[PDB]
Design an enzyme around this catalytic site. Structure first.
Site: not given
Ligand SMILES: CC(=O)SCCNC(=O)CCNC(=O)[C@H](O)C(C)(C)COP(=O)(O)OP(=O)(O)OC[C@H]1O[C@@H](n2cnc3c(N)ncnc32)[C@H](O)[C@@H]1OP(=O)(O)O
Length: 316
Positions: A133, A153-154, A162, A221
């Site tokens: 995830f 930080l994406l 990515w 999750d």
């Protein structure tokens, strides 16, 4: 596991260990009146890259072996991925994660005890499922690292792109590659995979019947969290797979989240030869002890990080 070509002075070292393979109840609900019920074996994998005395990145992956008479349904679940950013990055994080995750996917040297000195032999046919995830967060593994000068930080879309790039490169030739972005229209989801010919929208699980009998409940999750709720609210005898994913889109985590996404890839009918690879294995308690130590370290502080690393080295 890691190639010398990226870097090889001795400057970087790895932390890597598995739990001893442990039988658990199936993460997918199997009906009580079903023949050929499988045994489920779970292995936790923890990897970190070190540079000198500092942690650079970490990756936690859980592997589930659903062992049938003639084959294994093997689920590989990425639990956590994170970076520290105390130093200027000398390497691309993605180019370490890819190879490590590929190694973990392909690892087949587990020492599995017989089900109630002698280890169980697994079937040679394996069907692989890779489940990932994507959800941005300041921190997953390293407390207070978001404050660090070189932690990158994406945002959610960058993070998804990515992960797609990483996963595509280590699932070449797999039977499918699935992407879902719950709540997103199909054109928006398609845009992420337009340059990936083997990817399509959707998910890898059974399409019909009850959700709880199709979708694995993995720890921590976003999908699992909703599944848990369905089970505690006793809607598990009613909710279909299709309805599950429909309602998943309206969960706070997704609807208020930043491009929260679900990736699954499958490889069917792979013939696997058991291979002995000696790695550090630990009891579950030892594993948890390490992870608890981890959550108590201030990863904005070089001293605490170096001490953590020092203390690990003296251990084993
Ligand atoms: C729920 C899940 O399982 S998904 C959870 C993902 N994990 C997290 O969100 C934890 C917090 N986030 C992070 O730790 C990071 O943002 C990660 C792990 C997602 C990626 O770390 P990155 O350092 O960005 O990985 P990488 O080193 O490959 O950099 C990737 C891109 O950002 C660029 N970049 C890396 N460091 C920097 C930096 N310091 N300044 C600017 N750009 C940078 C890279 O050049 C690359 O850009 P490209 O796409 O043009 O090549």
């Amino acid at each position: 596991m890691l190639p010398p070509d990226i870097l090889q002075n001795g400057e970087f070292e790895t932390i890597y260990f598995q739990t001893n393979p442990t039988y658990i109840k199936s993460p997918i609900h199997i009906p009580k009146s079903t023949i050929g019920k499988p045994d489920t074996v779970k292995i936790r994998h923890f990897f970190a890259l070190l540079h000198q005395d500092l942690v650079v990145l970490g990756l936690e992956v859980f592997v589930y072996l659903q062992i049938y008479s003639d084959f294994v349904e093997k689920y590989v679940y990425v639990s956590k991925c994170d970076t520290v950013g105390l130093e200027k990055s000398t390497i691309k994080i993605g180019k370490v994660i890819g190879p490590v995750l590929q190694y973990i996917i392909n690892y087949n040297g587990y020492k599995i005890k017989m089900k109630n000195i002698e280890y169980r032999t697994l079937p040679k046919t394996q069907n692989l499922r890779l489940c990932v995830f994507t959800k941005p967060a300041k921190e997953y593994l390293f407390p207070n690292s978001a404050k660090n000068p070189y932690k990158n930080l994406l945002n959610g879309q960058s993070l998804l792109r990515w992960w797609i790039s990483i996963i595509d490169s280590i699932t070449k030739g797999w039977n499918n590659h699935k992407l879902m972005i719950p709540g997103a229209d199909k054109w928006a989801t398609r845009k992420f995979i337009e340059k990936y010919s083997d990817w399509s929208e959707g998910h890898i699980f059974k399409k019909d019947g009850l959700a709880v009998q199709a979708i694995p409940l993995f720890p921590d999750d976003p999908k699992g969290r909703f599944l848990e709720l369905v089970i505690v609210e006793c809607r598990y005898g009613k909710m279909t797979v299709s309805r599950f994913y429909q309602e998943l889109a309206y969960r706070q985590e997704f609807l208020l989240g930043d491009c929260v996404s679900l990736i699954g890839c499958c490889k069917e009918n792979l013939e696997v030869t058991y291979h002995d690879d000696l790695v550090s294995t630990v009891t579950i308690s030892e594993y948890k002890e390490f992870m608890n130590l981890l959550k108590l370290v201030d990863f904005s502080d070089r001293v605490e990080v170096s001490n953590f690393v020092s203390n690990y080295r003296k251990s084993k």
